[PDB]
Write a protein that binds this ligand. Structure first.
Ligand SMILES: CCn1cc(NC(=O)C2CCC2)cn1
Length: 119
């Protein structure tokens, strides 16, 4: 029933993601010098350092907001990929499955804690 517990849970999940080799293309913003057309395709860049910094700044109110930004990292990779078999996109799919597997309980616990608070 702890309404604040999601924050440390998200910090720990981000630490695991940064240890994962599959996160390396997503740890910092996409390099616009190496992918010069990136902003012609992607409206809202997102990366894991931006997510971590937003969390540490106290600029997420809920784990749902964090989850929306993490999902944007994956949807950007899918939208920019030239192929569904591309290396970076394939890494995003594995990392997304890992993220979804771990965020599920964080979201469930937060929503149940909030329902208890408003009972
Ligand atoms: C396929 C386009 N794309 C590029 C990346 N990553 C980078 O450019 C690295 C420079 C630091 C992050 C991820 N996706």
């Amino acid at each position: 029933y702890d309404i604040q517990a999601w924050k440390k849970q998200c910090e720990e999940l981000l630490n695991l993601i940064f240890q994962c080799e599959d996160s390396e293309p997503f740890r910092q913003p996409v390099d616009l010098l190496e992918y010069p057309d990136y902003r012609d395709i992607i409206d809202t860049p997102m990366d894991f350092a931006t997510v971590r910094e937003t969390l540490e700044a106290g600029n997420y109110e809920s784990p749902m907001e964090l989850c929306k930004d993490v999902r944007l990292i994956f949807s950007n990779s899918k939208a920019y990929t030239p192929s569904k078999r591309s290396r970076i996109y394939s890494m995003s799919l594995r990392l997304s499955a890992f993220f979804e597997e771990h965020i599920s309980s964080v979201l469930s616990d937060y929503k149940s804690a909030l329902r208890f608070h408003k009972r």
